[PDB]
RNA sequence: GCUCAACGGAUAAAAGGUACUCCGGGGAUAACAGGCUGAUACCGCCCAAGAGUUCAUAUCGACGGCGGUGUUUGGCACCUCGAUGUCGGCUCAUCACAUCCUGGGGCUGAAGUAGGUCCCAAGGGUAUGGCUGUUCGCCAUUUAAAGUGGUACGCGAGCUGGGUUUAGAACGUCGUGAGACAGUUCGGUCCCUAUCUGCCGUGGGCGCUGGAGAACUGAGGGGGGCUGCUCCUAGUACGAGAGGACCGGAGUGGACGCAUCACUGGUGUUCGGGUUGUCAUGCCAAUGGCACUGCCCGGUAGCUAAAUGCGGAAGAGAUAAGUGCUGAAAGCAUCUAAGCACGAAACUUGCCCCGAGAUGAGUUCUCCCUGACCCUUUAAGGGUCCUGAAGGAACGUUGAAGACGACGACGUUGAUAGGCCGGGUGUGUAAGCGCAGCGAUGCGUUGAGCUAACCGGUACUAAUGAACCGUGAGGCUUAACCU
RNA sequence: AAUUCCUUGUCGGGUAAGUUCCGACCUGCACGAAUGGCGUAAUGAUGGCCAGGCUGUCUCCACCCGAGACUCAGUGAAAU
RNA sequence: ACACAGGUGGUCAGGUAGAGAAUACCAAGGCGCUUGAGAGAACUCGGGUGAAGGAACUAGGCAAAAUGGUGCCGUAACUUC
RNA sequence: GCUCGCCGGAAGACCAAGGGUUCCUGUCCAACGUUAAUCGGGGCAGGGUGAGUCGACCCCUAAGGCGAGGCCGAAAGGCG
RNA sequence: AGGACCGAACCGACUAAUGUUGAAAAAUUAGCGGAUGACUUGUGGCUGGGGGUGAAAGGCCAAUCAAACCGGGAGAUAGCU
């Protein structure tokens, strides 16, 4: 559950450090989005030389939420960091390669079979 | 906020229609001191359910 | 639309402010000169026309 | 709404509801019967009828809640020395309620609370 | 002897400012709003010069012509000046159809995909931010779409007061000036306890023709109706390829609404622990008061959403636009005229809720009452002595019911509360006793001790004998049966 | 520009987006040197702009604590 | 104009904590402020807490939230030093 | 009477100023007191304020005020 | 040493909610500024209305000020309601 104006961290080796969600995508009037979801973001902080730049407008997939995602047993999966993996705007695939930290089983899909193969840890 | 006409005194009867009192139906009579009191209450003397529940 | 001159109900309660734009190029032209809108619309017709003669001119 | 709840505010804050049942239970044990109002008997059925649960059985460490919301130790010396052995077999219901007419200056509905074994 | 020329001539003789202002009056007269009007505006229509290779009429339309709307700007000065509070926002809206998305078509300069325009269709849906008093607009990024208008350009006895529109102050500017500026910039009191109407809830009265208790029927009314995306069909139809469908089907979303606390959380000042300063309990040890609940740490029940289940239909009828079928008038033709079919989120239903004060007061089902007499203005008559039913209210205990009322449960036979026992629960290993350590403190008893609303039991207390209310077979009229 | 109508002038900065602000540009509608000019540390319940921290401002409101409202007694107005 | 949440000068300075005549809790001392008593709806007035987010709100971070002491280290531009 | 709660560089003590019986007893509850009131700063009736040293008066004098004469001014008067 | 510093009393009144038939004919609650001086406050004294006074705003002069109050001219005058 991430709204706009929300500072997120970065989960790949793209080059950014601080991003900020400017639009929740994927649905008409769709007020919120959790993991497995696509948001338009800008970049507020990046490394001095990386794949990105301070102020790039692009999409990303959300991978770690402090809020929580539930499972059919009743177990809810929360984190302590809110990070996301940056995507292309057009092909909409991950740009970085080295995934940082663990991810969840809701992330796997035909669209996102790529990330979980590169993840260090999948719960 | 405030009225624009004088209200009729016949309306004043209609507003005070439901405003009447209501008296007691029947008084509980004691069975030892033999006196009327309030139902589920003690007597004036200190009796309830016959017995002397309080020395006054 | 309305202008934001001083006067209130003579200014803001009327459509004394015009804006004429171009369809194939997209060149707006506003005017708020006098109180009348046809002292403005027809004036903004002239100013867009004054832009229009320059469009061939500035290009050439 | 107060669904399944329990407790009357008594138009007082909780610090005064605390401090009023201090002296009200603090004097009922003394005189064995007092005149109070009926909502200060009926909410006191959530209070004094548990404040006789205070009067159950003597240890050394059971001299202490009867110090705590009472500020008194003389009445402690009455409860488990005399009244504990008095109500030694009653499994609840140590009191009785006598609705005794209305209070003069405000038409407040009064009542008599008392012990079951007063004589 | 007078441009006494404002020329029937107020004086020989006379300019301003006032947002520091004031009186007298005016809707006889301005500014908003209403009104009429429709010039202007907007929205259509008629003609077809042409463009569109040719081809006016796919798409457009010169020159002109005819209307509609009240919606722009206006005109008019009829309402209102012994007051009709205005910009924008916020909160709530509701209506129109000249339809933005969704639906149905027709034609196409419509292979498909994608459009174009036109017609039907108002059920439902119909962004967030940056800029700026904003409106508007620009932009960013959405969306299925970001409709347009009516509403005192809806809504201040609902809010806001940024803008405009007081007095302070300044610049630019103008005036000799006091001062002024549709020039700016800084600062600048938004009152009202609701009689009525209206609306949302909730009662009382009487009525429905003996009384009471119920179940309903359902006249009528309300709610509800949105949609993406993925996959299948299928790379199928089409097309040269690129590309890429109809129809039908499945899955998952968004948004909304209802329900809910099992979960996931919040709250939990009445459960518990920690801790500060102080005060008191003779004093230690213990507690307790006060310090925003002193400050925290947590947590039961309840209430709650961000927590989880549903919900939009399918179906039927009648249709709109539209497509037809037979078929004359009109030896042909011809969807119409006779007949006749199909046809949409609109309609009526289907879905839920309300509902016989539905005075047109309906229905069915069950219980109660089978006493005596007087009167005269002799009857739907009045009165008197017996009788008091069914049941009802009242009273008490009460509720996950509630402003009050009402509603529901229960009143000794009784579990209605409270208390009590059992249990769980949660703070988190009490007190006192030991033990070690100079001590602070640690260890032994020790999930011990405590435990709000909770689960199981318990009559332990409090739910009184009565009395009250309501009575005593129920109008007339025919009718039909039965005797 | 507290002065600029046009005008959201243009360019640069800043922001994803900036009618604001900060730099320039001089085309000063209508700056300008004691009704002073330009600059200025310190100062300011002074004006505007941007950040960190912070949080029910907001999304999107929930729950308790009290004071009224409502019930009953005693008293008892108001403008119109 | 009220037994009116206002205004009114001088003198007096107990304990603990505390820089303090701050604040806290108190002593001496003095009071519980002239309607009560219920109920525990909206609704305002005050308050407290808040998942995830952290100005998006708004004319405007208005108010709230937050910061806060004593030592010590360390401290830029600029300066009229 | 018993607890409880609050104030405590005061919600304690003390004066001036100002008030002018409110003070102390007895009595009374109509009115007065935002309810009752058996109570009261209420009514009624009684009491109650003692100074060579404290204060005033008194002896000084300031700001100032007045003013013999005096000066000035229609008059009233102004100044001193 | 300071029209120095933080900050009580004191003095002021900047913001916000209140309150607007009020507790109050301008106040409270929260904050805020000054707080050794161009300080603050007693007791008096003086300046009088076309006058006073004014770190100046048409400010203030007994809840009233672009000409104080009270009395008189005076039954001002009113082509106005
Ligand atoms: Mg009445
Ligand atoms: Mg047409």
UniProtKB/TrEMBL annotation, chain D:
<keyword id="KW-0687">Ribonucleoprotein</keyword>
<protein>
    <recommendedName>
        <fullName>Large ribosomal subunit protein bL17</fullName>
    </recommendedName>
</protein>
<dbReference type="GO" id="GO:0003735">
    <property type="term" value="F:structural constituent of ribosome"/>
</dbReference>
<dbReference type="InterPro" id="IPR000456">
    <property type="entry name" value="Ribosomal_bL17"/>
</dbReference>
<dbReference type="InterPro" id="IPR036373">
    <property type="entry name" value="Ribosomal_bL17_sf"/>
</dbReference>
<dbReference type="GO" id="GO:0022625">
    <property type="term" value="C:cytosolic large ribosomal subunit"/>
</dbReference>
<dbReference type="GO" id="GO:0006412">
    <property type="term" value="P:translation"/>
</dbReference>
<keyword id="KW-0479">Metal-binding</keyword>
<dbReference type="Pfam" id="PF01196">
    <property type="entry name" value="Ribosomal_L17"/>
</dbReference>
<comment type="subunit">
    <text>Part of the 50S ribosomal subunit. Contacts protein L32.</text>
</comment>
<dbReference type="InterPro" id="IPR047859">
    <property type="entry name" value="Ribosomal_bL17_CS"/>
</dbReference>
<keyword id="KW-0689">Ribosomal protein</keyword>
<comment type="similarity">
    <text>Belongs to the bacterial ribosomal protein bL17 family.</text>
</comment>
<feature type="binding site">
    <location>
        <position position="3"/>
    </location>
    <ligand>
        <name>Mg(2+)</name>
    </ligand>
</feature>
């Amino acid at each position: 559950m991430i709204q706009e104006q929300t500072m997120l961290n970065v989960a790949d080796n793209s080059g950014a450090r601080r991003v900020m969600c400017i639009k929740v995508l994927g649905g008409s009037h769709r007020r919120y989005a959790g993991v497995g979801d696509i948001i338009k973001i800008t970049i507020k902080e990046a490394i001095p030389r990386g794949k990105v730049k301070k102020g790039d407008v692009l999409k990303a997939v959300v991978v770690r939420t402090k809020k929580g995602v539930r499972r059919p047993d009743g177990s809810v999966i929360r984190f302590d960091g809110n990070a996301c993996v940056l995507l292309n705007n057009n092909s909409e695939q991950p740009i970085g390669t080295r995934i940082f930290g663990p991810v969840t089983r809701e992330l796997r899909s035909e669209k996102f079979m790529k990330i979980i193969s590169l993840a260090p840890e999948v719960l | 906020a405030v009225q624009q006409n004088k209200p009729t005194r016949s309306k004043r009867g209609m507003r005070r229609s439901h405003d009447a009192l209501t008296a007691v139906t029947s008084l509980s009579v004691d069975k030892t001191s033999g006196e009327k009191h309030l139902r589920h209450h003690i007597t004036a003397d200190g009796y309830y359910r016959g017995r002397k529940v309080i020395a006054k | 639309y309305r202008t934001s001159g001083a006067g209130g109900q003579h200014v803001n309660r009327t459509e004394s402010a015009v804006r004429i734009t171009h369809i194939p190029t997209g060149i707006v032209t506003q005017c708020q000169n006098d109180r009348s809108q046809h002292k403005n619309k027809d004036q903004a017709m002239k100013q867009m026309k004054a832009k229009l003669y320059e469009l061939e001119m500035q290009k050439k | 709404m107060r669904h399944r709840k329990s407790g009357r505010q008594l138009n007082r804050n909780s610090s005064h509801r605390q401090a009023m049942f201090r002296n009200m239970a603090g004097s009922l044990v003394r005189h064995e019967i007092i005149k109070t109002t009926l909502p200060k008997a009926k909410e006191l059925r959530r209070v004094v009828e548990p404040l006789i649960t205070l009067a159950k059985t003597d240890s050394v460490a059971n001299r202490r809640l009867a110090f705590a919301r009472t500020r008194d130790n003389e009445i402690v010396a009455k409860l488990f020395n005399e009244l504990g052995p008095r109500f030694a077999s009653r499994a609840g219901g140590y009191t009785r309620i006598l609705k005794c007419g209305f209070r003069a200056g405000d038409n407040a509905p009064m009542a008599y609370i008392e012990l079951v074994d007063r004589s």
